[PDB]
Design a protein around this ligand. Structure first.
Ligand code: CU1
Ligand code: CU1
Lengths: 85, 85
């Protein structure tokens, strides 16, 4: 069943797929380079926001409750690739 | 009519919209946070590549042929917002 944050991330993502459609569309109509470039940047910024809600969800959620057991090093170590790999 | 670079940017973008679908889908199935986070990052990296092909197209294209006339300052000045605004 679906979190606070995971819902919003999801809706954010849905919103971004439509944003993407628009860009695909204008590129298809041989749109002005700079305009396309700025849409693409708008999309990336929304992606950044969604990813950080994710992280945030993850930390209080799966991350924390690597309280009990092997948690610790493994949760961290793999958390690290998802920041940049 | 459609450029070298603008074609590829377009196909890249089309590819990314499908990538996005997948993410929307897994989030809908309450997917593992980290996995989702890493897809989202994969999408952003492809966006970065597409944007730079754009830039590259723009520079040889509309940017350059602000050779003649008021070109110069205006093309540059507005080019600058599309790097970060
Ligand atoms: Cu998680
Ligand atoms: Cu251009």
């Amino acid at each position: 069943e679906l979190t606070a944050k995971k819902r919003a991330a999801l809706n954010r993502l849905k919103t971004v797929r439509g944003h993407l459609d628009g860009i695909v569309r204008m590129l298809e109509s041989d749109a002005y380079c700079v305009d396309v470039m700025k849409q693409i940047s708008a999309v990336q910024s929304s992606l950044e926001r969604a990813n950080r809600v994710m992280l945030h969800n993850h930390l209080e959620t799966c991350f924390s409750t690597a309280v009990l057991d092997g948690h610790g090093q493994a949760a961290i170590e793999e958390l690290i690739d998802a920041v940049k790999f």
